[PDB]
Design a protein around this ligand. Structure first.
Ligand code: DSJ
Length: 211
């Protein structure tokens, strides 16, 4: 059947939709379709191109109130990529507290982690019951499932600036150095390449965690 209303969604609403590039873009909800127990949402992107999407592949164009966000919430967030920014899907790993200077920690679907503000988040409209089950990469999906279900039990390595450690990249161990710590994240310098990455302190990419 063709619907005009479904839960709090209404045909003609402005929304965000997931493109095949896996980045998220503004559009209009132009149709809602049922096939028995299934629902699909037809979106016209601001370029006139159209997709028929599942409810976990659309998000509201508004910032969620803090009482609606939990560890494990499915969100779209601002993803900082060199000098350019995209909207990309992730999972809430931490809500604001004194130790994180009142920020949200996001674990993005590609395995990147970053702190963001409430004004950098958008809630997915129809998340799955197990919110991690639409993460395409198997190793990223299994990590989130264990993290979210074990919380608040979170093994982490205590690190200090200047500490020499081994860090994983492309399946092997690299000589690296701790440059800075920010809450649950550490900035690692790869010593041969002379470039940095922000990594979660509970990641088995850090040899001390792995051991
Ligand atoms: C270790 C880590 O930071 C991490 C793991 C899985 C994932 N989907 C996203 C992530 O950010």
């Amino acid at each position: 059947e063709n619907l005009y209303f479904q839960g709090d969604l209404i045909v003609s609403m402005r929304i965000l939709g997931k493109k095949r590039t896996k980045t998220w873009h503004k559009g209009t909800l132009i149709a809602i379709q049922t096939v028995g127990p299934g629902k699909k949402y037809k979106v016209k992107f601001d370029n006139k191109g159209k997709s028929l999407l599942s409810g976990n592949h659309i998000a509201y164009d508004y910032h969620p109130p803090a009482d609606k966000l939990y560890v494990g919430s499915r969100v779209v967030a601002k993803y900082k990529d060199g000098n350019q920014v995209w909207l990309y899907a992730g999972i809430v790993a931490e809500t604001p507290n004194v130790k994180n200077k009142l920020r949200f920690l996001i674990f993005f679907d590609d395995g990147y982690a970053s702190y963001v503000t409430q004004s950098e988040l958008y809630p997915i409209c129809r998340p799955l019951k197990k919110t991690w089950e639409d993460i395409e990469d198997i190793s990223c999906r299994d990590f989130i499932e264990e993290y979210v279900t074990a919380y608040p039990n979170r093994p982490m390595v205590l690190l200090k600036s200047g500490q020499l450690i081994k860090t994983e990249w492309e399946g092997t161990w690299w000589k690296s150095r701790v440059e800075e710590v920010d809450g649950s994240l550490v900035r690692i310098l790869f010593l041969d390449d002379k470039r940095c990455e922000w990594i979660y302190r509970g990641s088995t990419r850090l040899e001390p965690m792995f051991s």
